[model samples]
Target: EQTPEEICEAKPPIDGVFNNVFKGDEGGFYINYNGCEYEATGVTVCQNDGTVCSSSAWKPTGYVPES
Candidate 1:
């Protein structure tokens, strides 16, 4: 499982794209965002076959507590 640190570390620093909004990881990435440890959430994705997929596996969420 990828750790929160690993996830955040791997994320390309939020750039001006999407007005600084960052894109979360695909299902293959196991990183979690510790920034929102208080929230209940799940991940959703759209696959190449035009199907939507979700996972209890892992994903990126949470807003930077200090952002």
Candidate 2:
């Protein structure tokens, strides 16, 4: 599994916006929204449902979790 820092270093697939990186329950990875990147994490949903689960790339100040 890739560390959060490593994932953060990668180039986001989407352009012009920020993306979120999630650490899966099974040591896999997930990215929320477009342009984000990931690895092998199993589940799709985040463990911390109501909290800030990960960090954003690109527009750091523009990032917001899905409502």
Candidate 3:
């Protein structure tokens, strides 16, 4: 997701880690975090291999963390 809406260059899900986000089967928005491996917190990262950081099969109650 580009910081600006008009840019054709989308912010890549790369080496940087993103918070409050998820990856699906896609998006500029978030998806249903499959919770595949990591679940200690609610941080999402696009990995160098192009896959989002692993999960724990436990999507959060609201995607956003709860107090």
Candidate 4:
């Protein structure tokens, strides 16, 4: 019932590193949550109500869907 999003969590020691990370045709970075893959359209380090990051800040990894 929404476009798609993630809640803040400045604690992704084992949360962000998932096998679902991928890059689309546009070289767009993406992550999976709740079985839904959403692009890092606006991935930013934000803190609301001290809730922390909506999307865990990450770096580019040499991984892909088809290799």
Off by over 4 Å in 2: 1-19, 35-67
Number of the predicted model whose TM-score against the real structure is largest: 4
Instruction: Kindly report which residue stretches of model 4 are placed more than 4 angstroms away from their true locations once superposed.
Output: 1-20, 43-67
Residue 41 in candidate 2 has what lDDT? 23
CA lDDT for candidate 2: 0.37
lDDT of 2 by residue, 1-67 (tens): 7654455455343322223545457654444444234342222343454323332322221233352
TM-scores, all candidates, are 0.24, 0.24, 0.21, 0.32
Predictions in order: lDDT: 0.34, 0.37, 0.34, 0.39
Per residue, candidate 4 scores C-alpha lDDT tens digits across 1-67 of 3322222132132224444455568755555444344444345343333323344545322222232
TM-score of 2: 0.24
RMSD of each: 11.6, 11.9, 12.8, 12.5
Please give the distance, in angstroms, between residue 25's alpha carbon in candidate 4 and its true position after superposition: 1.2
- Name the best candidate (by lDDT): 4
Per-candidate clashes come to 0, 4, 9, 1
